[PDB]
Each structure stands twice: as structure tokens, then as C-alpha cells.
């Protein structure tokens, strides 16, 4: 995942 918070 490129970023956090993607769940």
C-alpha cells in the first residue's frame, strides 16, 4: 500500500 489508512 502506497499510503496508510487504506483499511
Amino acid at each position: 500500500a502506497g499510503x496508510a489508512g487504506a483499511g
Epitope: 499510503x3 496508510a4 489508512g5
Partner: antibody, heavy 116, light 113 residues
Framework: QSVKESGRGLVQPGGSLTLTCTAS????????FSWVRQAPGKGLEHIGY???????FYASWAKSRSTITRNTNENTVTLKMTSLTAADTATYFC???????????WGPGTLVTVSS | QVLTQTPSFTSAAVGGTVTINCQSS????????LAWYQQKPGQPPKRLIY???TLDSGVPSRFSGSGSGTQFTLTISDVQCDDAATYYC?????????????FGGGTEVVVKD
């Protein structure tokens, strides 16, 4: 692949600011976008992040009085802040920061003056 | 203060060398999401480096990023007048259901002539 901020640039303490970030040349749900601000002669400070999937996350100082929202129909992301003081006078940017990925996109910024 | 940037102010003559350091209170996302921005007064910031060490488009080779974990460095060799600016490191952090960014306090770079 650009964004542009718009909104009322003169607001009063106790009021609210509403800033709209409109994307051009792409759809604004392809990426996560942050709101960032810079008070006069101060550093950049992160307000909040709307993930590509559509969840909003806020810095501690901004959590209670900020709301970041997305309208994929209009191709916009929106910042609302309430309980304004003169401390909120600043340039506001919407930006895909690109800390770790090839795409970074910043708007020109919009200057908000808070005064009564 | 997630990201501690030092020094606050540095200075060099044309052709000199500048180093800016960024210390993070915790690891950045994927140990990778750290970027360096250049801002001139009255203009939007410009991204110089992303993923710790990858140069962006329009960035001269005299800019170099390095580091890992909690320590990151930006160096400018053969410093030029166009490099006079304020520099910020920016880190991405979070988990699977939390996400944020932190900027360093910033470094003013003054080029002397």
C-alpha cells in the same frame, strides 16, 4: 494534473472558512489529498488527509473543528474549519504530497485573512 | 514534534555545500515515504526528493537525499543562487486505518555573494 483552491478570503473570528479544491486533468478520487497551511512567516503544517478510498484523518490540533470532505461528482475536496481565531490567518494548500510515490500535485494556494 | 529538522538556518557561498538533517520520532510508512520540499517566499513548495532518495522532475543533480529509519539527510553541493530557499522534510505515517503527515520545522538556506 492540477488543482486550484477557491473560497472566501475574508472571514471573521468566530466564523468558519470553507475552501474548495477542484481537480483538473484527472479525477480527484484517484489519489489521497492533504490540506496544508502556512501562517505568515511560519512553516508548513499538515491539517488533514483524505485517503484515496475516502476516509479523512486529522492532525490533533485540527481534529475537533475541521472537516475534510470529497465530492467525486464535482471533482472536489473541501475543507471546513469552525471556531476561527486570527491565528487561522494563513495560506491554505490542497496537495497530493507524494512522500513516497511519483505523483505530487500542489495548488497555487489561497490566502485566508481572518479579521473582524 | 514528529520530525525534528536541523539546522534552522544555514548559509554558504556560491559553490559551497549545505547539509540538512531530519530526525523522525518513528518510522515512516514503508520506511520509504519521506520527501524534501523547496519553498521560496510567496510561492507554492516544490518537491525535490521523494522515497528518501529519488529526484523529482526539474531537480538538479546537486541535490541528494539519503537516510533510513529515523534519520534522513538532504545535501546540496555546488550551491547556486537558485537554491536560496526554505527547505522542509515531510514524512508520512500511520497504520491500516490511521494516516497522517508531519512537516519538519524548516531550514532557511541563504546563499552569499
Amino acid at each position: 494534473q492540477s488543482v486550484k483552491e477557491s473560497g472566501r478570503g475574508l472571514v471573521q473570528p468566530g466564523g468558519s472558512l470553507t475552501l474548495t479544491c477542484t481537480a483538473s486533468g484527472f479525477s480527484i478520487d484517484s489519489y489521497g489529498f492533504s490540506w496544508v497551511r502556512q501562517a505568515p512567516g511560519k512553516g508548513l503544517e499538515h491539517i488533514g488527509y483524505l485517503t484515496a478510498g475516502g476516509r479523512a484523518f486529522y492532525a490533533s490540533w485540527a481534529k475537533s473543528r475541521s472537516t475534510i470532505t470529497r465530492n467525486t461528482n464535482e471533482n472536489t475536496v473541501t475543507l471546513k474549519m469552525t471556531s476561527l481565531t486570527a491565528a487561522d490567518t494563513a495560506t491554505y494548500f490542497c496537495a497530493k504530497l507524494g512522500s513516497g510515490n511519483p505523483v505530487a500535485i500542489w495548488g497555487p494556494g489561497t490566502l485566508v485573512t481572518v479579521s473582524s | 514534534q514528529v520530525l525534528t529538522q536541523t539546522p534552522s538556518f544555514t548559509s554558504a557561498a556560491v559553490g559551497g555545500t549545505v547539509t540538512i538533517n531530519c530526525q523522525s520520532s518513528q518510522s515512516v510508512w514503508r520506511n520509504k515515504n519521506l520527501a524534501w520540499y523547496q519553498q521560496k517566499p510567496g510561492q507554492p513548495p516544490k518537491r525535490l526528493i521523494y522515497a528518501i532518495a529519488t529526484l523529482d522532475s526539474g531537480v538538479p543533480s546537486r541535490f541528494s537525499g539519503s537516510g533510513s529509519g529515523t534519520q534522513f539527510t538532504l545535501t546540496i553541493s555546488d550551491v547556486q543562487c537558485d537554491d536560496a530557499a526554505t527547505y522542509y522534510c515531510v514524512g508520512h505515517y500511520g497504520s491500516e486505518n490511521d494516516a497522517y503527515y508531519a512537516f519538519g520545522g524548516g531550514t532557511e538556506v541563504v546563499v552569499k555573494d
